[PDB]
């Protein structure tokens, strides 16, 4: 009864960074949560991470930098269009200078700016700032 493995991954990272730690252990791996973490690693909010591969579903250890505020999840994956995308931004971003809602398209798991650079809508997946 883990209805969203993406939601449980990000909640664990959010508890451990406000606790002050350096590493986490994300007990189920997924190819949506490694393509969620490399969206926030390339913007520089986390560090190296290591997929501890097993023969069942793997585990992930993430190096936390301490440069993170909250890395929440939007749990019903509401479909967002490009007209709809700006009003999602002022709901769940702190400012217009920083922070990213990250959403999955047909062309990949992206940003809000990466999805409007390429002019494509999709399904909202999470946010981090």
């Amino acid at each position: 009864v883990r209805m969203n493995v993406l939601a449980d991954a990000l909640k664990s990272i959010n508890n451990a960074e406000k606790r002050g730690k350096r590493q986490v252990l994300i007990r189920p791996c997924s190819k949506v949560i490694v393509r969620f973490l490399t969206v926030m690693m390339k913007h520089g909010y986390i560090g190296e991470f290591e997929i501890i591969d097993d023969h069942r579903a793997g585990k992930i250890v993430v190096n936390l930098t301490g440069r993170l505020n909250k890395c929440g999840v939007i749990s019903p994956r509401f479909d967002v269009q490009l007209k709809d995308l700006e009003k999602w931004q002022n709901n769940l971003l702190p400012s217009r200078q920083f922070g990213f809602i990250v959403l999955t398209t047909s062309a990949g798991i992206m940003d809000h700016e990466e999805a409007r650079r390429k002019h494509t809508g999709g399904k909202i997946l999470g946010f981090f700032f």
């Binding site: 749990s75 019903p76 994956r77 509401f78």
Partner: protein, 71 residues
């Protein structure tokens, strides 16, 4: 908690419409027995005839007689 998943808009909408029957300002406006029962019948004014000059006593903090009628 509430039911959040996308496709539950039948349950969220049918639960909101029968929980609005639990405050005053919806239920006295949308039932009908609160407009059949006021004497103006959904009006701001009505005419009537005078039957009895009556005086009612004011509340305990106050002590006076308020001059009323029996329209």
């Amino acid at each position: 908690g509430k039911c959040r998943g996308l496709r539950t808009a039948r349950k969220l909408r049918s639960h909101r419409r029968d929980q609005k029957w639990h405050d005053k300002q919806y239920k006295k406006a949308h039932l009908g027995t609160a407009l059949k029962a006021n004497p103006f019948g959904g009006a701001s004014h009505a005419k009537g005839i005078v039957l009895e000059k009556v005086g009612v006593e004011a509340k305990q903090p106050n002590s006076a007689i308020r001059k009323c009628v029996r329209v």
